Amino acid sequence: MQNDEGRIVDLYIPRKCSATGRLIPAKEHGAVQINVGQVDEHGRYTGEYHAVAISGAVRQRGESDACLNRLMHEKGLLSF
Amino acid sequence: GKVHGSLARAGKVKNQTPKVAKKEKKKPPTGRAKKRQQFNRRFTGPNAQT
Amino acid sequence: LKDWVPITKLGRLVRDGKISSIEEIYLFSLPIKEYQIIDHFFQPGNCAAPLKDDVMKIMPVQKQTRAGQRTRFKAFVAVGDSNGHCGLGVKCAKEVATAIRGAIIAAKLSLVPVRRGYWGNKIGEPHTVPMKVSGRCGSVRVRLIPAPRGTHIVGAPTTKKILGFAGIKDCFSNSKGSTKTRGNFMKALFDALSQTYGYLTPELWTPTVYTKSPYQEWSDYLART
Amino acid sequence: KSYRTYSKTARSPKRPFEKERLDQEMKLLGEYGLKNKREVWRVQYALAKIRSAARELLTLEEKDPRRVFQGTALLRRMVRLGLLGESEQKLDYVLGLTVAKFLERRLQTKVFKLGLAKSIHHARVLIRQRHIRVGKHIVDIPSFMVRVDSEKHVDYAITSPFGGGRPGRVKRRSLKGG
Amino acid sequence: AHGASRYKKARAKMRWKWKKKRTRRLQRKRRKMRQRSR
Amino acid sequence: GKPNGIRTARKLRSRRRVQKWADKTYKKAHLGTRWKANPFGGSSHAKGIVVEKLGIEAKQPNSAIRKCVRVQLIKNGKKITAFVPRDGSLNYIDENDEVLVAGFGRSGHAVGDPGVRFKVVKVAGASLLALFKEK
RNA sequence: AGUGAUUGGAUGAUAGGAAUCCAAACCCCUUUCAGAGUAACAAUUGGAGGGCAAGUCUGGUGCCAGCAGCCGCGGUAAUUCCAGCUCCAAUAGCGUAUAUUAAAGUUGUUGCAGUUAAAAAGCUCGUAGUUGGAUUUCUGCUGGAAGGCCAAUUCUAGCAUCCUUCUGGACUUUUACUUUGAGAAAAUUAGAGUGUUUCAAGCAGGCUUGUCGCCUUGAAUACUCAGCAUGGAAUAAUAAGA
RNA sequence: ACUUCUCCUGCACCUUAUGAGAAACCAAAGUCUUUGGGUUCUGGGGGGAGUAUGGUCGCAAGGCUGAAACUUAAAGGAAUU
The missing domain is CATH 3.30.160.20 (Double Stranded RNA Binding Domain)
Incomplete structure (x- = not known):
């Protein structure tokens, strides 16, 4: 949301749910943000991670986990 | 409604009430000069009896 | 105090x-x-x-x-x-x-x-509901529409106040249903304004940054009472 | 029968009684020294001609030959009338006008702005009592509205006591009486 | 008319089945009386 | 639902002109019975002579005697009862005195406290307000 | 910064001239002798329970008289009647009655509703009417004229096997559709220009000791289903099937 | 004949919805102010009235079509105490 020349007007940007790509509003208290930690060789290790967020619209279906598998198959660390 | 309601009492309270004259007072301003007074006395309920 | x-x-x-x-x-x-x-x-x-x-x-x-x-x-x-x-x-x-x-x-x-938009040309601070946004509550449909600048707010007196408290300068209100029930009408107007951020535009197609939470970054303070 | 056009300069609002509306109108009477609520609704109506003209034009397209003609004619009026300042000539700016912009441009204020009148109310009385030369000839009417080249020009009429003429009638009665 | 509601009986009423019959007897009578004056 | 298709002008146009008559206010305008009905001739005001002075009682809860007048319109000689506004003024009417009749402001129907749709605006052309005021 | 009749000195309403106007009077515009201090040259019209802005005031009346568009006030303490005082709204105007438009997404093409609120024919056939599946020269490269802006967007010729009878029109089934164009009275309506003192208006004006006055003066322009004409590759009818 | 498993086609049923609704409830009453797949019929506050008159079908009983004057500020729906 720009105007005239630069200056991103408005306050903040709503997070976009990974599973549906649909924006999470202010008062969705059923929203989630997972952190999943990486590992080095013979790890061990955390602190570097893949963040991922999903809305309460997706969760109350029961389709949270099936989509969250897809979002960490493409990263590498599952093999479904 | 019934037609035979009597017309004797018509003009009871207009005739009953005690007459009294209006007091002589100094005239209010009119037009623009009235809207001057109404502007000032608000910004420096409106009718508050004892 | x-x-x-x-x-x-x-x-x-x-x-x-x-x-x-x-x-x-x-x-x-x-x-x-x-x-x-x-x-x-x-x-x-x-x-x-x-x-x-x-x-x-x-x-x-x-x-x-x-x-x-x-x-x-x-x-x-x-x-x-x-x-x-x-x-x-x-x-x-x-x-x-x-x-x-x-x-x-x-x-x-x-x-x-409440996010707010411009109606066509976009100069000098936003002034409107950014699109046609509806809200409902209990048989009271309310529809807020962008108006040109200086239009002011068109709606019921109740409508003017709680769009006024948002900061929305210009509007065209419609209102189906029993607007007599002010409890439902305020909730209908309010839940319209709540949905403004929820609506997805082509301005917000870019994938998100994902910053750390305030719960994350100040975790070590919240360890101690 | 007679071929004379005529129109209404103002129209009353839909709600008679609103405390939001009546307070904000009463400020415009108090600032600029107006007779009645018709004088506000006149300017309310006069803006909405200009505003609805720009609202029609602005929807189209900047390269459209109707907008480039009719827009530039409308912007000339706002520059001439001293309503929009010349630094911004965008049609968009016309929308951001208010009633206070029009009511600062009328001759009640521009006397007072000039400062000869002293007080808003006095300035209306000076206008109506045949003082104040605007340009070449004197002007009797509060709701004149000045065209920005003319504004420097307002001065007391050549005739009259402020101007340098016969001192009305009451000063003569004192002077000849003594 | 009345159509479907016909017998809604939302509040204390005569009862529709009886009402229809009462009007039929009034109507039937209207016929013979109007044919008598021919 | 409706027929949407481009050539469905007849069905759309016919349905309005038929089902416009389902309105109550449309029938009061557009039927021929408006001209026979009313004692007025589709008119604002009408003169008449006061055949009799009459009194009627308001339906409960309100109770009282309202003081109205029976009048015959000059054009049709149709009797009507016209209410007399304000305190007294009954004395003012005088049987056989011409009185202007105006609508009660409810488009017939009825007013408040029974079956009266008219108000007497003037008596002998004097008018009610002038006398009650005494101005 | 507002009050306080405490005094205080500083323009036309009016009445009569002058010239101007007028066919002859008259009005306007000018300038004139008189012409306001409770500025007696005195602003009224509807309201003050809610809707609706504005009094739990003070007398009289006691479901009486009356108010009240609707809801409701009045049965002896009336925030609604009849008065007084104060305040509110509009203001040289304001109230009432009837018709009409918006509000009316309460006639709904845009745009309503039909289990129970008003409303799905008891059920099938069915002629008009309305509506009807997919599919038939798509893609590519090289120009040309323009083009906005610090090459995009238009339009157009070729070449992948592309007519010709001539020197612009004939053929491409036919229309609808869309585009541009013709022709269609003004007044009114929107609208360009212009200080009628402003303004509603009006179509005028504006420069200037110059005299065949000048601005080769202005009074633009839009708007006005069916009908006539035309560019076009989709969509939809329709035709057919050497 | 029975067991296990898949396919369409029936009458339904249970569970649940960031789908809907005024709510009761609803795989349709969903995909409708983010309003247009095609089409038929019906309704416009409550009475008066499915009455009156005229028409037409019927052997009759009655059916189909179907008003007005006047009347009235509420009728009506779903849940709560």
């Missing part, structure tokens, strides 16, 4: 002054449970500007039980600071002033940010 003892993770963080402003809370979508959190951000003079509260309506409610009737008063209160922040709250109580206290507390707790 007064030094409240913060309860919960959010309460502790705000008093210390770690979280900067409420857009950080609204991003990660965290429930503000005490009103003392939101009292902190809108400080007098400092707030620019302080939150303003107006009492929309007072309605006597009666329950017929046994001998006699018991009447309680339900107080609708909207509250907002012009510049995108608005809220809407209700409470009932046996006396009138005791309802309005708790109604203002509930109004602050249900405080929601």
